[PDB]
Amino acid sequence: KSQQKRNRTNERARLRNKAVKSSLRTAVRAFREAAHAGDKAKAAELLASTNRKLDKAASKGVIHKNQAANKKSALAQALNKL
């Protein structure tokens, strides 16, 4: 029917969203790697970017912020461990 705009715009939205999500998880990988290596300072910088990326997306409506809470809080504690 004449509502294919619903589909097309869904394509744009999901495309950008999952691209963003992949970039987030990539950063997470780096942070966790910093935890494994022990470069706490680098992990802190990466955590700052994560703060400026994760919540940035959440403010774009990717999540309802709960994932940000679990990830930042848990990983900050992980960094507190190491």
Binding site for RNA (CB under 7 A): 1-3, 5-10, 12-14, 16-18, 47-48, 51-52, 55-56, 59-61, 63-78, 80
Structure tokens at 51: 């703060």
Q: Which is nearer to RNA, 2 or 41 (CB)?
A: 2
Alpha carbon 53 to its chain centroid, in Å, reads 6
- Cα(74)–Cα(23) distance, integer angstroms: 19
Residue 11 beta carbon to RNA: minimum distance, rounded to whole angstroms: 7
Q: Which is nearer to RNA, 37 or 69 (CB)?
A: 69
Q: Cite the beta strand spans of 16-81 per DSSP E.
A: none
